[PDB]
Assembly symmetry: D3
């Protein structure tokens, strides 16, 4: 179960309003790699785990922390939309506001009354297709590292899209929390690989066709990938290289369907 | 530009038909972590790169290979649907087929004439929300490792959902190529991390609030995560632990909106 | 069965063109709470009803009227897009059109030839996930009241986003029809609540855990909700208040999955 | 900010496993009117409010409670999927499992390792298009009443779809919480309506075309809606009835587009 | 404006209930090429037309007709769901219904009270991404012919998925209307091609690079398309054939982006 | 299987950057009727065909060509985004860039590092709901003609949305390839109609209710469509016309559902 305090985890107040920045920050709230994706993925994985408490608790700690980041971004967006222009009266007040209006999300005013949405900057709704929880923590720890990496890259870009010290203060905190999240998930990942294997899942080595398991196949005519030839892979074996990959499966000959289907194909 | 040969990369013909397995394999064709997601992500990333040829070509080689995997899975699905039941005639010939029909995707017969769709097993259309190409290859190589990890996990599970030796032969080839892909991407990732830093992006360490960058925060009441306290993180610094994270940002108080919005909130 | 007349229900011509207003009005056509949502929801509910003709006919009457509103908004959008700027040649005649072009939906010209789409202002397609028809009219009449309330609020907001008297004339008519629809739906709601009960569905009181049915649980640390304590609910019973809600379900321990799943969780 | 305890709010363990019921319960977790829609709507509205603490705190109390319900449902799905059949070895052990297997979501095993997804029973991803937060609490409290009414209707149906006492125990608690949530939201609604008006928004009465505000228009030829004629609406004015609604807006003719659009329409 | 009559355009009552057929028929209501797609596309195009009344009226006639088909299919689904099984009590009456239950859409009972949804058989919501209205009727008439062709193909398939004479009677009516719709749209299509040209749009012949306009390029290694060489196209010119298409565009080299983006690509 | 060459099929380099045109070109990449739709539709149909090699090979040839067009568009967008403004430093250097920035897709910079997305200009993700492969090539060849028609119309419009000769050079090539694709698909369609019939599917004529197959029904009150009366349809029979379509199916009366559903409808 959860409990809430009205106090934010860290400052989320800008020095000045900026409805364009509000739109950009929707990425961190409702976007593919944003805080809702983290919260929902880590909590889902945390609830699904039946294994080591060390990782299960780490996931519940972090998914709960991400709810605090969702709260911060939502709040920051609301502050950034204060006094945003949305009608002729604003333009009569100041005609330069037409370009600001042109760059805003029309729904921030019309649908949400100058409050945050749960969409990305282009109005695309956040959706559970962005969430991963597979039951396998070697795979999902790798996902959690990527989640924090794409997120931290976006936060770093956002840092250069504003000169507001209040906004940057919040971003500086999130950058740091994302550094910690990348590190802790890499540690868990490393511990899990040591236990189960560097290849996911680590118990299928005997089953796969080993003959194709370490060959770089050159399907494009560039020469760059040839530099991997002869390098030792993480599992201790070297890569070989095939300049001209061959088709080994033959030409398919699927049986025509039942006439009740009317599959008229010539 | 691309060129095509009708010959498959590797065998994709089952020993017998199985429309239930056909529906499961739709995961690998139109699902979140399936081969289409691979093909579109790697090609997009490769086209976007202005960097070292070694990684750009690796992406284009692999994206092109995943197109061959898409073709194989589509082909396998078509074979698996040969003679599938879809109407009263079929139940007339064999009433047991009713439980088979109940587990099939009704659109396989009705919309596609017993051929593959580009949806997952539940009819959800594949979509670009599953693709990642961010411009930063340290982050995107981590994504690519995850893409092949989740995929190989699913293929490993598919292997246990059939006893068809023809189906398994194809799966054993995919497992091996996914091993190679996981390895090559891990290699690329390690080289980029060496060049740019283990935290993504690597050039923001002076900007983040350092004080919070290595603190594990205990938001859930289990003690499992305390085990990380004092461990050395991949960047050479130790993790500290905070048993009681504090709310540091205060209580928000945003300004009420203009009356033209009619934000009646008591 | 339906029949159509080319004449519109009410005026839908603006005094002047305005492609920015055309984009906003997309919300009333293809948005979450727009006219298509009302049309599809009320017709579905009316077709589903096997009950009192009073409500079934009210639903078909209103659903049919909303089709007229869809027609009117589609028409208004077309008039508002007359002579809209979309390329260099327009800028040459009037270079002040650059900001207008920047705030337009690029698809209005490119995809639709300066005609309405069935998307919202951000290009998000209208979809059936916005529709509700549950088989229970006590619940669905509450939904219908909400549909008209959110719609009338957006129309009220649109009223302040233009000074065009022709646009406003149409909005004034819509406001009035939405007043009527809110009222007719509240009347039907009221009657049904009187027949079946105020809690939906009204025949489960003996089944629920009554001990928890009138307790306000304080999950967030603000004190505002305490004001409800001791007030009389709509069912005649008073609210009680719990300042410190308790976790009564214990800690879950679900069984680890079959090894064939490769759920490696440490 | 939020904190979490591993203890569930209320019991969420079934007496026996049942993967078909697990699939139905996905409706309460990832469905249109499910607990996720509840959690996200109330928290969004709560963070958005700048109004009375009485309602802001209520929204945050309830949004936070709904996160516990999400946690319970996810856990219950987990228990219900224990030992679920997913491959040929299971059918060899017990042939009768084939129909169970046919009615399951194939992704529960293949993608999630026999854990919950954030999809509905048909694999459709939960998405933010289900959420409402408009800035107007008279409208949004009406939405909140509907959200709890549709949810409680669904939980009531689920009660008749199982005979498991452990499952029913959880449903009996949810029923009771949905009773309190419907009531408290109705209470808040009534207070807001007294302050602002029964029509949303309450301040447009002098703007709308009053002549059409209380007329029931008969667009379908059934006779049932005439029963409203002469009844007093909630605002104290009687409904009038129009048996033959008139088209007052004429026939629109919009101007053909510029030749550069190639709008060839004969 | 529209008017409704409770009478259906044609019979839509099955001889017996069949909830599996109900689910299949969801394709005709909420699917990609179903009647809602026809209805919204033809009405959108008809409202957009500024051209000849012959086509504009045809579109409005047919779009209106399609609403009658939507109503018929919704009604049919309702009848087919009469007495459908959804709980243990049903299995107590007739254990053989377990398979029927496994094949049903779980939401028909749970969400809709055994009534139609606006989704396809797999629960995917109908959406406006299925609709086309471009402003060019040479293009859109071709789309309309396709719409009716895919629909009639699906109806033909449904015909073989039931032996219920009542259901087939309805299907026989739809096949005929779809024959008429295909013919009328092909006739309008032919007339518009005569006026504007067979290539869409017809006024760009002098602009395109004519050298590549009649060349069949052989990108896959089969010899089948060589049969087109020397055949005469519908514009009177013969197809030529290139066995080895050449890459004429060079190797792209885009400029590395600004460091503020952190595009670390090695 | 596929192979790739770094060389583009044709020139894809603009003379100058233009982030607004970049946004418009996303329609051709990730939009409903764009090159991705073509690629996936033709490959899917090609893989599904079990009929004549002439058509199967044609589909695979063209599907493979469309991948080159995807590559060209992705490349052209990357060049058009070179040096695009995204933050305050840009505006400090040149304040006139504000209107450009206002019209851009915010995700081009923030998510993709000034590279292409797989979304349309409005950020709506490309999805498989755009693709058709039905198993019947008479219907699907009609689809393919439409796909190239809508695409070519959009390309023709883009031509008028820029004065850049480099961009225009690319569009001139696409226009020609789309002329060829329209023609080749119309040729195949014609051959298939000649073999199977002009109505799709061609083998259901004795089943449909013939009485209704050639009747134009006047559902909207315009007189335009009467002009089709007596004209000869493509199947050699004349159209009749019905000025007042009659409702022949009566008034539906479906049975009230089981009480366990709580369908309270009055
Ligand atoms: Ca290569
Ligand atoms: Ca903890
Ligand atoms: Ca409180
Ligand atoms: Ca009526
Ligand atoms: Ca060929
Ligand atoms: Ca007419
Ligand atoms: Mn975070
Ligand atoms: Mn984080
Ligand atoms: Mn692969
Ligand atoms: Mn791979
Ligand atoms: Mn209306
Ligand atoms: Mn209304
Ligand atoms: Mn709840
Ligand atoms: Mn609740
Ligand atoms: Mn029809
Ligand atoms: Mn039709
Ligand atoms: Mn092309
Ligand atoms: Mn083409
Ligand atoms: O995060
Ligand atoms: O974060
Ligand atoms: O974070
Ligand atoms: O693969
Ligand atoms: O692969
Ligand atoms: O792969
Ligand atoms: O309205
Ligand atoms: O309305
Ligand atoms: O409305
Ligand atoms: O609940
Ligand atoms: O609840
Ligand atoms: O709830
Ligand atoms: O039809
Ligand atoms: O039709
Ligand atoms: O149709
Ligand atoms: O093209
Ligand atoms: O093309
Ligand atoms: O194309």
């Amino acid at each position: 179960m959860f409990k809430h305090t009205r106090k934010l985890q860290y400052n989320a107040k800008p020095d000045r309003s900026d409805p364009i920045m509000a739109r950009r920050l929707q990425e961190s709230l409702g976007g593919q790699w944003g805080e809702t994706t983290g919260m929902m993925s880590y909590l889902s994985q945390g609830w699904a785990s039946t294994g080591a408490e060390k990782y299960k608790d780490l996931l519940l700690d972090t998914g709960t922390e991400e709810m605090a980041h969702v709260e911060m971004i939502s709040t920051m967006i609301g502050y950034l939309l204060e006094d945003a222009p949305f009608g002729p009266e604003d333009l009569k007040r100041d005609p330069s506001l037409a370009t600001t209006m042109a760059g805003m999300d029309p729904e921030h005013s019309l649908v949400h009354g100058l409050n945050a949405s749960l969409n990305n900057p282009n109005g695309a709704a956040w959706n559970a297709g962005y969430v991963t929880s597979s039951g396998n923590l070697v795979a999902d720890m790798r996902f959690n590292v990527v989640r924090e990496s794409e997120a931290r890259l976006q936060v770093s870009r956002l840092y250069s899209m504003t000169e507001d010290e209040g906004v940057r203060d919040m971003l500086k905190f999130l950058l740091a929390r994302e550094t910690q999240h990348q590190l802790q998930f890499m540690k868990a990942q490393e511990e899990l690989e040591e236990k189960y294997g560097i290849i996911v899942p680590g118990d299928m080595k005997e089953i796969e066709h080993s003959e194709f398991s370490h060959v770089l196949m050159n399907f494009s005519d560039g020469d760059g990938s040839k530099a991997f030839e002869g390098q030792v892979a993480k599992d201790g074996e070297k890569f070989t290289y095939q300049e001209n990959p061959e088709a080994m499966g033959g030409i398919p000959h699927i049986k025509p369907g039942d006439p009740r289907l009317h599959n008229h194909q010539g």
